[PDB]
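Private note to self, pasted from the team thread so I don't lose it. Backbone tokens:
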């Protein structure tokens, strides 16, 4: 997370950390709890190549990475079948936990948006994670969960931005309809936040608008952060999640 601050302990009870086996179980992506047994994340965190489930664990909301881990194994990794690269799209995946977790005020699910919600510029939205705090700058110990409020940019304006300083013809769409843009040169997600949630408060309820997906670096001019647009994948999600 670039900009913003440490999250208060009561916030973002759905945030999870994805861990890969090594000298220690290291954080490499975010996710969100959408059902007591299911985690939503980015396909690029776990694909397109099939990896060994044994080498993956999920950590539910904690204030600091690593201190008091309770790591959870995964029974299934379901990756959207359209996925092969983040720039193309369908950058979305589901992890089924081996057990359903218990929920409380401290750890619970996020609400998914209705098919119709567009998330227009000016909506209050936050992205959260334990990712880089600037380009090639990791989150320092003790690894607090960070949050930042990010401004939504309409897709067409984001797409135009992405064409500035680029050779790509204006009619070749880079920022696609199944994607969403947010952030600026002071506020953004970054490497290590991938797969985590962008949430917007709508009529008093937090809805997950986006999954952290890609962008050119972090907080760079004319290069807002790009998120998988959750509304586009609701039917797919509901094929697996009760
Ligand atoms: N700040 C959000 C965020 C969050 C999490 C991970 C993030 O990046 C992870 C990786 C790094 N990377 C990347 C690296 C270098 C250059 C480019 C570009 C471009 C471009 C420019 C103009 C027109 N067309 C195009 Cl395709 C893309 C990317 O795409 O994914 C970003």
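Design output:
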């Amino acid at each position: 997370i670039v900009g913003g601050q440490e999250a208060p302990r009561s916030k973002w009870p759905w945030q999870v950390s994805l861990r890969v086996h090594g000298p220690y179980w290291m954080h490499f992506c975010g996710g969100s709890l959408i059902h007591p047994q299911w985690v939503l994340t980015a396909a690029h965190c776990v694909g397109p190549d099939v990896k060994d489930l044994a080498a993956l664990r999920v950590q539910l909301r904690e204030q600091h990475l690593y201190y008091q881990d309770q790591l959870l194994p995964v029974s299934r990794i379901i990756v959207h079948p359209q996925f092969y690269t983040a720039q193309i799209g369908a950058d979305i995946a589901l992890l089924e936990l081996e057990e359903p977790v218990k929920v409380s005020s401290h750890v619970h699910t996020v609400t998914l948006p209705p098919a119709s919600e567009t998330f227009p510029p000016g909506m209050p939205c936050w992205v959260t994670g334990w990712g880089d705090v600037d380009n090639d700058e990791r989150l320092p110990p003790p690894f607090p969960l960070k949050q930042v409020k990010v401004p939504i940019m309409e897709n067409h304006i984001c797409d135009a931005k992405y064409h500035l300083g680029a050779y790509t013809g204006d009619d070749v769409r880079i920022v696609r309809d199944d994607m969403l843009c947010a952030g600026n040169t002071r506020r953004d997600s970054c490497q290590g936040d991938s797969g985590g949630p962008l949430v917007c408060k709508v009529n008093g309820t937090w809805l997950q608008a986006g999954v952290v997906s890609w962008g050119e670096g972090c907080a760079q001019p004319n290069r807002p952060g790009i998120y998988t647009r959750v509304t586009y994948y609701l039917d797919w999600i509901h094929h697996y999640v009760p």
